[PDB]
Amino acid sequence: KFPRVKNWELGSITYDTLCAQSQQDGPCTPRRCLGSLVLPRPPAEQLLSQARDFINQYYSSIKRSGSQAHEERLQEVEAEVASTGTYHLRESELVFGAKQAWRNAPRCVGRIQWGKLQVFDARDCSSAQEMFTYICNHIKYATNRGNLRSAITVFPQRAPGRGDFRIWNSQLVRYAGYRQQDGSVRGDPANVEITELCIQHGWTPGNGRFDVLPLLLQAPDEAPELFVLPPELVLEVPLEHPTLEWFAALGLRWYALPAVSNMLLEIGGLEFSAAPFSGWYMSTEIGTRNLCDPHRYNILEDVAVCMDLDTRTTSSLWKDKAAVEINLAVLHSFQLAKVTIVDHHAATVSFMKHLDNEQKARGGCPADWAWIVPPISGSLTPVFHQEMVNYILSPAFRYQPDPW
Amino acid sequence: GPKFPRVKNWELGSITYDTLCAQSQQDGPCTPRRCLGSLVLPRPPAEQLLSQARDFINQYYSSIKRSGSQAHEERLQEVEAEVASTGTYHLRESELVFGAKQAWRNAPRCVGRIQWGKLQVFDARDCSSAQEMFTYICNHIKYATNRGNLRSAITVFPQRAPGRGDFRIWNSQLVRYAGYRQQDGSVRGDPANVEITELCIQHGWTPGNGRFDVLPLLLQAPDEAPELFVLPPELVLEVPLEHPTLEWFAALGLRWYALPAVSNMLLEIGGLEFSAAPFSGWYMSTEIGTRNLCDPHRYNILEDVAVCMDLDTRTTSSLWKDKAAVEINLAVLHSFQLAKVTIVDHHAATVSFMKHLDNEQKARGGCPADWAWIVPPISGSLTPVFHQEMVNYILSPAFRYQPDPW
Numbered sequence: 135k136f137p138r139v140k141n142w143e144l145g146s147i148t149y150d151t152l153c154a155q156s157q158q159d160g161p162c163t164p165r166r167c168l169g170s171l172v173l174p175r176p177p178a179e180q181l182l183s184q185a186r187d188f189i190n191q192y193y194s195s196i197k198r199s200g201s202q203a204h205e206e207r208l209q210e211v212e213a214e215v216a217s218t219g220t221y222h223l224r225e226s227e228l229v230f231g232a233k234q235a236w237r238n239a240p241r242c243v244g245r246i247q248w249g250k251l252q253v254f255d256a257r258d259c260s261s262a263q264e265m266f267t268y269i270c271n272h273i274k275y276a277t278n279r280g281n282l283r284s285a286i287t288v289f290p291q292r293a294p295g296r297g298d299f300r301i302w303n304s305q306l307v308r309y310a311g312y313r314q315q316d317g318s319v320r321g322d323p324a325n326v327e328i329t330e331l332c333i334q335h336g337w338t339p340g341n342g343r344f345d346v347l348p349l350l351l352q353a354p355d356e357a358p359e360l361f362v363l364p365p366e367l368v369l370e371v372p373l374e375h376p377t378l379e380w381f382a383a384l385g386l387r388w389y390a391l392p393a394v395s396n397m398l399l400e401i402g403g404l405e406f407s408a409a410p411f412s413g414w415y416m417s418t419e420i421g422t423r424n425l426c427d428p429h430r431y432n433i434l435e436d437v438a439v440c441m442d443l444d445t446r447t448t449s450s451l452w453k454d455k456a457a458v459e460i461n462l463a464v465l466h467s468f469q470l471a472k473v474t475i476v477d478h479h480a481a482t483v484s485f486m487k488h489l490d491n492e493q494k495a496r497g498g499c500p501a502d503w504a505w506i507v508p509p510i511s512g513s514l515t516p517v518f519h520q521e522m523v524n525y526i527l528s529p530a531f532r533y534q535p536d537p538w
Numbered sequence: 539g540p541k542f543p544r545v546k547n548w549e550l551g552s553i554t555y556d557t558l559c560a561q562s563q564q565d566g567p568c569t570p571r572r573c574l575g576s577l578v579l580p581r582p583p584a585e586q587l588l589s590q591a592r593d594f595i596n597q598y599y600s601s602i603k604r605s606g607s608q609a610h611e612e613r614l615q616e617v618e619a620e621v622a623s624t625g626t627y628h629l630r631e632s633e634l635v636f637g638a639k640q641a642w643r644n645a646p647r648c649v650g651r652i653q654w655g656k657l658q659v660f661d662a663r664d665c666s667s668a669q670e671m672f673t674y675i676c677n678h679i680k681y682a683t684n685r686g687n688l689r690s691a692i693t694v695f696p697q698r699a700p701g702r703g704d705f706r707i708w709n710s711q712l713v714r715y716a717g718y719r720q721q722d723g724s725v726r727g728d729p730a731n732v733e734i735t736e737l738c739i740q741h742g743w744t745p746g747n748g749r750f751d752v753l754p755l756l757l758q759a760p761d762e763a764p765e766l767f768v769l770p771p772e773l774v775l776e777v778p779l780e781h782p783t784l785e786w787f788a789a790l791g792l793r794w795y796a797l798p799a800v801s802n803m804l805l806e807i808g809g810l811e812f813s814a815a816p817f818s819g820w821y822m823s824t825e826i827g828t829r830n831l832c833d834p835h836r837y838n839i840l841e842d843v844a845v846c847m848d849l850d851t852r853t854t855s856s857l858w859k860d861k862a863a864v865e866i867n868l869a870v871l872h873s874f875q876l877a878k879v880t881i882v883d884h885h886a887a888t889v890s891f892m893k894h895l896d897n898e899q900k901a902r903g904g905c906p907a908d909w910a911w912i913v914p915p916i917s918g919s920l921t922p923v924f925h926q927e928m929v930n931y932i933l934s935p936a937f938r939y940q941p942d943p944w
């Protein structure tokens with residue numbers, strides 16, 4: 135009933151009793167495991183139960199469970215849902231639900247920070263124009279001149295029948311991807327599609343590898359509007375190597391603020407189709423995946439050649455060598471430009487403390503091993519040796535379909 | 539679309555559906571409520587042995603393209619008969635070979651399965667004494683090692699009989715280094731083998747005191763205390779470790795054996811259980827150069843090496859671990875190659891596994907794979923398997939883990 139979780143490096147053993155709190159099924163069955171898959175294949179009753187449960191969680195957190203306010207609040211919920219089929223959250227509950235959602239996110243290695251989160255309430259938003267206003271202040275606050283601060287801005291919840299508020303982009307800041315001559319792609323191939331949708335709704339494209347995309351904000355049941363972020367708002371870091379003086383020539387750079395904007399935030403049944411959040415990057419996100427993925431910037435061979443390595447054979451480990459320097463570059467740069475950044479070694483060790491804190495606080499922690507273990511040097515980090523249990527808890531961040 | 543799991547590769551964008559998982563008959567540890575896929579270890583009825591025996595026979599006759607033939611029907615009638623009167627049964631020579639290869643083919647944690655059809659199966663089912671086991675084991679090592687040009691192979695000992703004690707090899711591999719517990723508490727040698735070393739000593743072994751002492755074998759015959767045997771040094775091939783451009787690396791005196799030979803798994807076929815069936819192939823460089831030499835709970839040489847390279851080991855942001863881990867793997871590859879001993883780097887192996895998936899998609903509708911184990915310990919996303927989704931499920935014949943015989 136309760137899984138046994140073991141750390142094969144130290145021999146320690148814990149029992150995950152938190153999983154019993156899961157009210158939603160994952161992708162696996164006793165016949166086969168689909169844990170490595172990226173993507174998974176209301177009546178008054180539904181909303182009500184979730185809402186009540188969430189309200190019970192909120193009052194336990196403030197040590198006033200069963201109290202007077204707890205009672206009246208549960209009643210305000212029955213009351214609102216009974217006559218409108220739904221309800222609304224008080225600002226302090228919303229703040230509790232957002233932090234809780236981060237806490238419950240199995241694929242995030244930085245949850246040690248879950249408690250420090252600045253929540254911006256933008257549920258009184260009525261147009262894509264206002265959205266762009268809230269987004270500009272989020273970026274301005276989150277970036278904080280390089281000394282990054284975690285934050286999230288919550289826009290209006292979804293309402294039955296009506297169109298959702300949406301941020302078409304998957305990150306507030308993303309470089310354009312332009313399909314050219316042949317199958318070739320200039321810039322970031324992952325953003326090819328969104329780049330084309332931006333050109334379709336106007337926008338004079340650039341012809342660079344690192345052109346910051348415009349934003350396509352959408353208000354309910356209306357076509358999306360294109361807005362352009364003030365360049366002084368979008369902080370960037372030119373990449374250079376601590377010893378490889380020619381690395382800087384490559385003209386590589388990345389944005390300082392990782393701001394996910396494509397996920398759905400579910401709290402007590404309500405669903406916030408638009409709620410961009412941001413913390414700060416872990417160096418492998420940029421150094422290994424963004425720059426070395428074959429279907430991304432794919433700069434592995436370039437830096438290899440420049441390093442005078444033998445790309446003729448795999449056994450020379452030229453791939454591995456270049457990947458380490460490129461990652462070193464990202465770390466060196468950021469620290470030099472005085473912008474917040476965490477290396478995969480420091481991040482996974484803090485994640486280990488997080489597991490212990492959560493073991494004492496709740497009896498376990500939902501974790502997706504495939505995502506927690508970094509893209510390079512997996513076993514050189516402590517999480518590789520740590521067993522993990524994955525399950526879905528609410529509040530939660532979930533993936534949702536693309537607007538178009 | 540289809541009523542089977544959809545499987546995507548995110549590098550290429552290609553999709554496939556796994557229909558082979560419908561052949562599974564043993565449930566794993568996951569439930570719709572929680573996934574335990576990252577767990578290393580998830581926690582006979584005359585009627586049930588038939589179900590398995592009958593299934594395996596159909597599998598065998600389909601591989602030779604004779605399903606429904608009279609020979610097929612006769613083999614089934616015969617198997618049922620033999621079990622209905624003795625409570626068990628035996629596999630013909632050809633079925634053992636088929637079954638052995640299928641167990642490897644079905645191993646979810648093995649990245650070298652593209653070599654599955656090429657496996658030398660040595661039948662040693664006649665064996666009747668620990669001493670005899672040792673002759674077979676030495677022959678296997680001799681044949682498999684082949685002076686550096688390794689050849690995959692497996693030796694099969696007598697299956698588990700009713701009430702009768704199992705044949706067992708106590709060591710986890712036929713060739714492993716001793717682990718000596720120091721008074722201060724540190725370990726000299728390979729920490730993973732401390733328990734098997736102590737047991738050998740109690741059983742009569744005269745331990746050495748180096749970091750790399752080839753351990754003696756503890757072979758147990760049915761209903762008997764394990765007898766101990768030492769491997770003639772000429773049989774056990776080893777490779778000294780040097781680095782191509784860092785001359786001081788050789789000074790470290792690091793080395794590793796050439797033959798990887800798992801000896802603690804149970805080979806299961808049609809319900810029959812072969813508690814002792816050691817197999818070997820050849821190393822993927824990361825096994826040695828990353829897990830065995832760098833795991834903090836193994837040799838743990840990362841710092842020693844980083845210090846020699848003059849890296850700053852006081853700050854994780856220098857990526858000193860990554861830098862030393864790479865060079866160490868380059869040293870393993872360089873040394874095996876210079877010594878003319880078969881070895882495969884993680885880039886070559888993962889690429890071959892991607893080819894194996896494509897072959898199995900056509901041949902069986904899929905392939906059971908353990909993502910956490912398939913993706914290499916260093917440079918994960920730099921290899922193609924990191925971007926390949928994988929479905930995991932138990933298929934029989936199979937290699938299962940078995941409790942230690944003590």
Ligand code: HEM
Pocket residue numbers: 232236239241242243244245247251284285286397411412413414415416419476481505531
């Ligand atoms: C404070 C620093 C933070 C760091 C270093 C961090 C790092 C990470 C990393 C490395 C991943 C995987 C990224 C990928 O492979 O694409 C991740 C995923 C995620 N993080 Fe965090 N995170 C931080 C803050 C946040 C915040 C504040 C939230 C939300 C309030 C959060 C929510 C998530 C979620 C939902 C995922 C999975 C997203 C997906 O599936 O694409 N993280 N995080």
Ligand code: HEM
Pocket residue numbers: 642645647648649650651653657690691692800803817818819820821822825882887937
């Ligand atoms: C021909 C070269 C071979 C290569 C390169 C290869 C490579 C690998 C690797 C890298 C692992 C994981 C090692 C670890 O993390 O401990 C593995 C596991 C495994 N291999 Fe292979 N393999 C080969 C041959 C064989 C053979 C001949 C068999 C058996 C007939 C086989 C059966 C298995 C099994 C059952 C496992 C799982 C062991 C465990 O769970 O601890 N492999 N293989």
Ligand SMILES: N=C(NCCC[C@@H](NC(=O)[C@H](N)Cc1ccccc1)C(N)=O)NN(O)O
Pocket residue numbers: 172173304305392393394395411412413414415416419533
């Ligand atoms: N450091 C982070 N990291 C989170 C990065 C999330 C990252 N996710 C991704 O890039 C996912 N691969 C998008 C995806 C999901 C499912 C199917 C297809 C594609 C992104 N949005 O940029 N966040 N902070 O600090 O808030």
Ligand SMILES: N=C(NCCC[C@@H](NC(=O)[C@H](N)Cc1ccccc1)C(N)=O)NN(O)O
Pocket residue numbers: 578579710711798799800801817818819820821822939
């Ligand atoms: N290249 C290989 N690799 C297989 C290596 C298997 C390797 N396995 C291991 O070292 C597992 N960690 C043993 C274990 C499993 C579960 C719980 C505790 C301990 C070993 N035996 O040496 N083999 N060939 O070629 O057959």
Ligand SMILES: C[C@H](O)[C@H](O)[C@H]1CNc2nc(N)[nH]c(=O)c2N1
Pocket residue numbers: 170171172504505506548924925926927928
């Ligand atoms: C197929 C596989 O699930 C996929 O490539 C996953 C693996 N682990 C990951 N881990 C992180 N952090 N981010 C990712 O995008 C992925 N991709």
Ligand SMILES: C[C@H](O)[C@H](O)[C@H]1CNc2nc(N)[nH]c(=O)c2N1
Pocket residue numbers: 142518519520521522576577578910911912
């Ligand atoms: C806890 C986790 O399951 C464990 O460390 C696994 C991860 N992946 C692995 N992969 C391989 N090839 N071998 C291993 O021993 C492991 N150990």
Ligand SMILES: [Zn+2]
Pocket residue numbers: 162166167168169568572573574575
């Ligand atoms: Zn699972």
